Amino acid sequence: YVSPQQDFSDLMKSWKNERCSPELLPYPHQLMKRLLNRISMQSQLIENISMGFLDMQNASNANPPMPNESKLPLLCMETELERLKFVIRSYIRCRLSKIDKFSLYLRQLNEDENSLISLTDLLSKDEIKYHDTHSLIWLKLVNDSILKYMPEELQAINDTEGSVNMIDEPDWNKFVFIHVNGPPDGKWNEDPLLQENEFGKPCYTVTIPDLKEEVELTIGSIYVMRYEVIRDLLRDDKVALI
Amino acid sequence: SLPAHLQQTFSPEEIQFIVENEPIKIFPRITTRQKITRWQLITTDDKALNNMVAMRSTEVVLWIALLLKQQSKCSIVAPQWLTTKELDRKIQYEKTHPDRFSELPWNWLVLARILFNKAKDDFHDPIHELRGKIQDLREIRQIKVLKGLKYLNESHLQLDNLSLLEINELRPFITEIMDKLREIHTASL
Amino acid sequence: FGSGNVLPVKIQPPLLRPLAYRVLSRKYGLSIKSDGLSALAEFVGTNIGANWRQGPATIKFLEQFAAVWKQQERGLFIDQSGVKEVIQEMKER
Amino acid sequence: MGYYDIDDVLADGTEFPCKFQYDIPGLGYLENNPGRPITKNTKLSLPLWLARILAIVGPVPFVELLPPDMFSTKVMNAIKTDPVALDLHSINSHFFSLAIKWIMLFSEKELANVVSELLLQRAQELNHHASSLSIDLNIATSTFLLKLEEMEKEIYKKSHESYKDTKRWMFKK
Amino acid sequence: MYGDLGNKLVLEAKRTKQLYARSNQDVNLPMYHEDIIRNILKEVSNLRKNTEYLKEQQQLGMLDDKVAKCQYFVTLLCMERNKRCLLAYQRLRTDILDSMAWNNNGLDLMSSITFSQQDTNNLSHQEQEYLKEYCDLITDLKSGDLVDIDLSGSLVPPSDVFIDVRVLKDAGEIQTEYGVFNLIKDSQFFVRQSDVERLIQQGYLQKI
């Protein structure tokens, strides 16, 4: 770590994985904190130079900031901050929409005792407040509008035993485009999953049980593949959603 | 995010953003070497930008290069693949092998359009010839994509060297067709 | 909102508008008109002593001015009434 | 299994033939005959949200599902002979959803081999018509888009919109 | 039979979806369907009465159990179908409302100045209430940890530092950070894109 370029690379890869994935990916808690702190300090910095340039100007009708080696640096600061803010905004709003889509599923996950998935890790605190408030508001709306005139036998908005399941869950077999990066950093011999093939670079192997077949993914090729069989590789950065 | 589709596919402008987030080479027309205000960037390394000398080759990110060429303080050198010779080699490779895609960079269309729009003077070859060659390549790639679309199934596909824009313009059709085929197959089990 | 300072020094709004802009236009609210900006100079100059390098005071003043515009419907542009809403604010306390 | 999907709700309300296997009084509004009780071995067309469940609860269930008219041998032969020219809209506006439903209730490998081929052969024409962006300086498209299922129109709209946006961004001056 | 009316309601939803799908600009929801909804309410109430009557008629022991089970199942299924139709309609209308609420930079929508996209009387009272709390939720999101980032900002990437803009509606002088814009109608500006995003979003400026 301790590299501002890698923070931006990680944010971009997280955003790209977020847009194309069906599920609700875990929240990178530390990266967001570091980026927000960096933005907070940087905005203060540009404000400081702006104030310093403004105050001296009015004092004794001095010349403005001399144009050479002056305007372009500060303009670059502003535009860079603008781009970074846009990227984070798009990431946050996309994940908020995905939270909206899967409210009942997340509630059922949180209510289950024997579930390793917990909302304290998968959901940010502000996202927790959003989920709780939106669920209550929607429940109030539906209860006031429709559900009050219904028999006590069926008055639940979540019914897993009815004719049609009322709790929607993510599609675990959606087809996605992936690119095979290989090892996240290097040391191709270190990775145990890598296995060499004939007259070619080492390729990963996966199995499709419903089809009952073995599929080999060669490094440097783009594939259209099921999402479930590639979850571990994406979690370990071996593959990247395009 | 939510409005105007955007749920599961990128817009062309976002693809352009990703393309402009990539390095490029330039010839500075100004000297900002430290004496014997500074850039201090937070998402890109500023070592090259701080240490600049005129009439020497350096590399920076693309959008800074466009911002500099908006003024008169830069001159972007087009990549070596943007030449008539290197394009004619790829056209021949494309003709000879009718079952594989040629090895072009994953941003060739977007980079070509951006460079033709912004840095028109920097090219050495006449620009109309290159513009014709790009269309000549695109048509053949479209023919190969049309032939390859026939082999759709429920298991997996491989598109080894397809470009980013070509993948983006074809994703919604391909994904949905294979999804429907997969549901039909799964139902019968 | 307080009194007893040294004296109301007069300063031009040019050195006051950036803080008001960042607090109001960017985050929540907008349209600080020129006449309204000049009006918002007097009350902040009433307690001007040892400020523009201080801590919370100016930010809290802008927060309180925003409170009226969330409470009352009002509009977008800020006009010579800007003192009229601070009269309401001092009525509240 | 989409509770809030509009198209699934619509397609799930189609009428299928069926036969009562018991004799029961009190019914009759199914036949629009209020007072008349239903007899045994009576053939009526019931909606799918009812006939699906009535064929499971009983052992022998209360009602038997009869072969549909949209899955006859004539329709299969017409599908096999010429997939593109066939008018699936006239047969039923929700052919595919009901097809997967029928495959799910009754495991039929023959139908899964025919519907897949039909979809695969119609996808090529769908792509051909979706990729044809007009240039300013045909009867085929108008004829073909009137033969499209409800599901296929969504795919056509998505592909067409994506192609138009790509072309618009490429030639923006 | 019993649910045949509710299908009509679902059909209406489909039409609204098309207006949502084929929308170059923001649109307005059509009139509410309180009369159809009240008709489903009446018929489900009648179904409840029928279920009660079946309960007593069975518990006096005049009818066989196998016979009563069938009409019990039929009434239950009809009520379930009616619930499904009503919930689907409500969720579609709710989603469109949420989209509009997000696409107005937060704010209180109808109480304050609105972009005139929607009339007051189209929405139901419960929908009007729901919109208010949803807007408050957006508001206290925007004041969370993500203060610096404007969660209600523009969603098109920035790629042009300096733009040409034209004023659509007349206005007075507006102060901006380190300067002033004078909004004389039929006048053109050449200025940075960041300064005029707010004014373009609110309809006081044209072009980009």
Residue numbers in the entry:
A (entry chain D): 53 to 294
B (entry chain I): 2 to 37, 48 to 200
C (entry chain F): 2 to 94
D (entry chain C): 1 to 58, 68 to 146, 159 to 194
E (entry chain H): 1 to 208
List passages from the publication reporting this PDB structure.
Structural analysis of the double-hexamer-to-dCMGE transition indicates that three sites (Mcm2>5, 5>3 and 3>7) exchange ADP for ATP, whereas Mcm7>4 remains ADP-bound. On the basis of the cryo-EM density of the untwisted lagging strand, three flipped-out bases can be confidently built, which are stabilized by two conserved residues (T423 and R424) located within the Mcm6-specific insertion of the N-terminal pore loop (ʻMcm6 wedge̓). Together, our data show that the double-hexamer-to-dCMGE transition not only promotes the untwisting of duplex DNA but also the disruption of at least three consecutive base pairs, with the resulting orphan bases being stabilized by an Mcm6 pore-loop element. These contacts are found in the dCMGE complex but are absent in the double hexamer and widen the minor groove, which decreases the superhelical DNA density.
First, the MCM helicase is loaded onto duplex DNA as an inactive double hexamer. Here we use cryo-electron microscopy to image ATP-dependent CMG assembly on a chromatinized origin, reconstituted in vitro with purified yeast proteins. Our results explain how ATP binding nucleates origin DNA melting by the CMG and maintains replisome stability at initiation.
